[model samples]
Target: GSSGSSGAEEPTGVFLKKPDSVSVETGKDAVVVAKVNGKELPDKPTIKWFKGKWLELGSKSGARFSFKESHNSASNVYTVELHIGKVVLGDRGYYRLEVKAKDTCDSCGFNIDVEAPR
Candidate 1:
């Protein structure tokens, strides 16, 4: 315990779903979920669902995001729902969800490959 025993007890590192890459249909919705192993994280670990950090998350002006806890699972598990209402060219970018817990941070990231509605 170099940084004290408490620090060691806290969770560290991050993991991301939709890793590698994924596709998102325009004018549709995408669900992003993140998880941690065995760590009793905070009720709400700070989340940032962003587009290359250029676009702000849950903006008052436009960006809309809704989050909820996973059912039939531990509260520690979290999911971020990004409602892609009419995804435009501007929406084509890396959409990322960053998670930070009590003593550390972890993130799950992916890119939005918009395909025409079928």
Candidate 2:
């Protein structure tokens, strides 16, 4: 088989905005966000979050959660944010996000450390 000019490799079509480690106070909010690279995320795209040992949704207690999309019209950045409110001492741990893709999923695994109110 000959390599032709049109033999361009297809894009992964998925982007992951890696989240950074966060530290917050007790009874406060800890927000973590993971983003899809493209302008638009697939319909009902698979998104799952975990703490510590990769637990499923509704596994973590005492944490109010929300997931929503954000777009920057100027820079054209699209993101899906995971917000956890009213955190406690037990909420201090590693956080994981997995966004489903065509063949593989995009992931951002980070840590969260909660400290007492100062």
Candidate 3:
């Protein structure tokens, strides 16, 4: 018995979903989710989250910042979530998501607007 080929040709290369701007009051958590699609993407790609233009978010921030990644094999898509706890006024700026897999790379950017508590 022979196996049948997959019906549709899944597109290759990294593609990112448009990240929406986040607005939250100071001292509250700000969460952002980024969706990526690609057939050739690796199980764990080099993903980076940045504040403004060059401030990369990492473990150094302790519990202030956290990152999570999940994949959907059925749809060939990936979801990346960023959680910022106790946001401050300084956190109000552009947030960037960069993903790199082998020879393909893609990125998305959005803003985070922080407001003081009333």
Candidate 4:
């Protein structure tokens, strides 16, 4: 600790997310977006997403699409949003997103699958 120097505010180690598992039609593209509630401390974060396994997702196969938000609009109130594309059958199983703030980070998650209606 330094005199008159309040240490850096710690960011949230806790996080909230959506879709424990989602289903969409096989031949169609699926879109998944996540919202984070960094409600405790304000920390500038880098959002990262990983693509999963290989399944028959219509015409695409083997990680057809993937992305991450290097930055997002912060409300400084609720949370930030990370948009993930190409949630196809090819991308089954789990995709992990590690939200890194300053000191701490949260690691909740989600999943994807075929819609099974068509």
- In terms of TM-score, the best-performing candidate is 3
Identify the runs in model 1 with alpha carbons over 4 angstroms from their true place.
Answer: 1-20, 36-44, 61-64, 70-75
- Between candidates 3 and 4, name the one with more favorable TM-score: 3
Which 10-residue window of candidate 2 scores lowest in summed lDDT?
37-46
TM-score of each: 0.59, 0.66, 0.75, 0.54
Assess the local accuracy of residue 64 in candidate 3 as a C-alpha lDDT between 0 and 100: 75
Candidate 4 residue lDDT tens string, 1-118: 6566456554433554453556666666666666565544357655555545432222333354543333335644334333335444555566665666766666556776765444
Order of all candidates by lDDT, from best down to worst?
3, 2, 1, 4
* CA RMSD of each candidate after superposition: 10.3, 10.1, 8.1, 11.9
Please, what are the lDDT tens digits per residue for candidate 2 over residues 17-75? Answer: 67788888898888876666654453435667776774675554454777667766675
Count clashing residue pairs per candidate: 2, 1, 0, 1
In the range 9-41, model 1's lDDT, one tens digit per residue, is: 434443423344556677666555455442445
Cα misplacement distance, residue 4 of candidate 1 (Å): 46
> Where is model 3 poorest over a 10-residue stretch in terms of lDDT?
8-17
Q: Compute the lDDT for candidate 4.
A: 0.52
**2 against 4, candidate with superior lDDT:** 2
- Clashing residue pairs, candidate 3? none
- lDDT on C-alpha atoms for all candidate structures: 0.58, 0.70, 0.77, 0.52
